């Protein structure tokens, strides 16, 4: 399915997890001193690719990037 990649420029807004409709994302802690918050993509099978996460990311350019790929019943949002 699709792949959501999260890069070093995260700052811990948490907005990506909120805008997501499918709960593909989760905020995890960082062992480092940067912050106690990093975005993750644990369940990418439910990613549909609506790019709402990329609309809520206030970086110079996207810390969290969604790369489209192979399709499935879930990623296409087909209730039939």
């Amino acid at each position: 399915s699709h792949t959501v990649k999260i890069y070093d420029t995260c700052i811990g807004c948490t907005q990506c997890v909120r805008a997501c409709p499918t709960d593909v994302l989760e905020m995890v802690p960082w062992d480092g001193c940067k912050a106690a918050q990093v975005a993750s993509s644990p369940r990418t099978e439910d990613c549909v690719g609506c790019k709402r996460c990329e609309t809520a990311c206030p970086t110079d350019f996207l810390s969290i990037r969604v790369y489209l790929g192979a399709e499935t019943t879930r990623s296409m949002g087909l209730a039939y």
Partner: protein
């Protein structure tokens, strides 16, 4: 799964044969008061006093519904994934805490220590099965 179905006469927008054949999801929640709430797909329904249950064709219908229930000040919403063999799993809050808030048990998944700007050029990666975003 135990709960009362919200009372509504029915609607063409709802579960199809994909529910029985492939998979169906179910959302459960508890209320203080019986109110009226818009269903995820068309219409209105009267949620009961406690332990409501609703079967939804997709996971998006539940989290979309969960946002509406939060405006009614209900945060004890839970979603399940029901397979045709009856297998049920605790999907959305796999950890009891919500995804927005932090927990120690979680771990990083698909993290790139580099920046997007430092991605490798694709000409460096061809005829190898590798993608630039890895």
């Amino acid at each position: 799964l135990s709960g009362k179905t919200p009372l509504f006469a029915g609607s063409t927008g709802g579960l199809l044969t994909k529910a029985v054949e492939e998979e169906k999801y179910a959302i459960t929640w508890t209320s203080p008061k019986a109110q009226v709430f818009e269903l995820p797909t068309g219409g209105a329904a009267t949620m009961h006093e406690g332990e409501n249950l609703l079967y939804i064709a997709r996971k998006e219908y539940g989290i979309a519904l969960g946002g509406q229930l939060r405006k009614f000040k209900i945060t004890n919403y839970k979603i399940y994934r029901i397979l045709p063999s009856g297998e049920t799993t605790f999907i959305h809050p796999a950890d009891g805490v919500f995804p927005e808030k932090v927990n120690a048990g979680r771990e990083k998944v698909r993290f790139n220590a580099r920046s997007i700007g430092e991605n490798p050029n694709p000409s460096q990666v061809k005829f190898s099965g590798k993608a630039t975003y890895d």
